[PDB]
Amino acid sequence: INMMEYLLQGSVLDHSLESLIHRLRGLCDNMEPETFLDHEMVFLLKGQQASPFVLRARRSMDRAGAPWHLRYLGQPEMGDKNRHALVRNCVDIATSENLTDFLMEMGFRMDHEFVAKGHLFRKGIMKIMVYKIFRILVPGNTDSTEALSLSYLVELSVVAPAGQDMVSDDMKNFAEQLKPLVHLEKIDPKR
């Protein structure tokens, strides 16, 4: 069926970051952190419509043999069903490594690349990712990069089935367990 993604987002200045991580190692599951390092690139298809189609492709540079990942994110639902999280339609697809070449045949062109380097935790269904967004200049190269800002970004995400309430309330409680350190909230993608 059609699965929905619930998002809460925020940010954290880096000199307080470690305390956040220590807080997360208390609250999230009994695991060591994951330290993911990913290359993300955004393709778009300039169809007839006013809205061009958008697709996100991620190659996990750090882990060899990890399948590439496609993600289609639907536009956010204006209905006030879950009032507190970005509720979107998510289609996530594991793929082989010729993907970009295949997408070049489908009519897609690149928009921007960015590295994302950070940590990954989970709590039940929830996925906490705390990462820094790295701008790539010299667009072919993945080493020539610069940090976008001083702050790290924090995302609390749950991918789950369409509708399916009592999900955003648990995300509210887990966000409120961090509220001195981070302010996580449903931020609209407009402006």
């Binding site: 987002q9 925020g10 940010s11 954290v12 200045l13 307080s16 305390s19 956040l20 955004v42 928009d111 921007h112 690349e113 960015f114 967004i133 701008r135 790539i136 976008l148 800002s149 001083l150 702050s151 970004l153 001195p180 350190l181 981070v182 302010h183 931020i187 993608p189 402006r191």
Partner: peptide, 24 residues
Amino acid sequence: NKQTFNPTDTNALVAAVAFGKGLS
């Protein structure tokens, strides 16, 4: 008392990851 998070950084980063503002 000390600030742990800058909200302008939050808006800049979520505008950077939501679409290409600041990357290209």
